[PDB]
Amino acid sequence: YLAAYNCTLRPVSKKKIYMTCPDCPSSIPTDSSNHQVLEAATESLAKYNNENTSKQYSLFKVTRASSQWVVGPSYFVEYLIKESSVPVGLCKGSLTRTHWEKFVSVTCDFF
């Protein structure tokens, strides 16, 4: 039996990541101050709703986020959803803008 616990966690050191791989998407806080991460998760969700005609889904919460800027602003995200409940699955997705071409990607697993 587990009587009690506490845990301290961190994202991997941003300097040590940059030094290992300069272009790697640096991880960031998932809170609502990041409008563009919310745009990324809602764009990937909109793409998933456009791809999946059987059911439609709504954003519960964004669980992980990162971004990169090489081809342009490029956001990568994981987030939770429910139909239109306890959140029904985990989504994974992205949003990228170049100055001209634009890209959105999405994959989701139901629990």
Next chain:
Amino acid sequence: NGLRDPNTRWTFPIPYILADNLGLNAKGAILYAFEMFRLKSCVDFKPYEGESSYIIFQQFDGCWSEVGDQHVGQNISIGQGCAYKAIIEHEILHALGFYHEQSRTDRDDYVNIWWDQILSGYQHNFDTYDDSLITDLNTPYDYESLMHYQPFSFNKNASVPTITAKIPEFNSIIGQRLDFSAIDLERLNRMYNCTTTHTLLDHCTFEKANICGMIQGTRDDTDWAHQDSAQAGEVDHTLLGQCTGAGYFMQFSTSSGSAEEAALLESRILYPKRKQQCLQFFYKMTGSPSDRLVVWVRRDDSTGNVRKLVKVQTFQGDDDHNWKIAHVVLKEEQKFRYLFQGTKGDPQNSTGGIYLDDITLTETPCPTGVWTVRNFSQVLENTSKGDKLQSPRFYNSEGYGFGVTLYPNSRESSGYLRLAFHVCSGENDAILEWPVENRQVIITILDQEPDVRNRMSSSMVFTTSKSHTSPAINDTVIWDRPSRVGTYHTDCNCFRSIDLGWSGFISHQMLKRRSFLKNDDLIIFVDFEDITHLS
């Protein structure tokens, strides 16, 4: 910006895996970047065969590489849009132990970082490394470097630059995505001790009196002049009379003598590393319409002696007397020499000659189709926004007709040029499969430098796919048979598809710089080749 520790250096060929999660467009863009490495450096690539370290290229999130050889073998990612050749080249330069140019130890001497304008949580992507970690390779900081970040990178506000050059001119330049810079090659070569490019087999501009070790035949009647560019209109193609006493071309007069007199200009012997070469050159034919510039190969007859002639192409005069590009597919697998037979026809009806300059021989496929837009600066002024140009119909290796639309003044992007490939109907269409999917288009604005290490040719890449659709064709595939998907054009007497490619292909402020325009001639190459075999 190179990682000092020599253990971090690859040993060539770098063995690679392409993961099957990569699209075809990304697999073909990777192999096209490898060709640029092999063409501009001694960097080489091989398929994987169980080696201790290797690159695996991936379609993971984002577009990124560990820096230098990780001796376990390493991921590179190529997410969406990083299919662009220059972004593959940038990631492979990270794999080859290179950090970003704004991460040099001395970077603060050359670029401002506007920390206040960086997104909170991203300031560390502008860290600079100490000189124990990185060498300068005894090179200056290079704004033209492919390793440099553009002004609007990681910025809070789209209008406000994160990074700017202290020499303010270079704000318009930093973070170019054309190609390797000359200093990126100089660095890469210092890093790997590269002295010879794998595919640049020969180049010549005749600037030196030994004419690049070409020779003139004696079996022929006469000789080509090595011509001094000094006469009133008769300038070389290398320098266009910009530099006095210094431009040179081979010239073969046809204004006098008998018809059918000739001169052979013949290269020094050449040892091809591949089964195929492209002989590019620039030429004029201001003489008679019956003059003929014939390109020949003299090859090893298998005795080890180069004496077996092979005619390979003929060129003939036009009302366009201006310097024209040419490409000749050679297929030489044994030592040889490329030859130009200038041949007179009707000399009484000639006031000029055949001219050669800027010869380049690369062990590559030739561009599938080449378009030269004459007087391009003047065309660019005279073009109203939304006015268009269309290339003559070129034919691909599989016989698919195709061509490019060029809109010089992009209405979509004021100050940019728009290039858009389309399929054309042609003589083969009934036998070809449609839609023509899995065919990688590579458009390339030639940077007109004869030495391929001096070129930064802008190039964009897409692959035809079922994804490409329009309501204008009931949302059928754009790449279906042009009889049922394109609009008939009277000028080509052919059906041209809905056109696809890039608004913003290049800025006018970038096309003018770097010698892409040269003598007011926007030379666009196109390739349009199947890549289904990469699946």
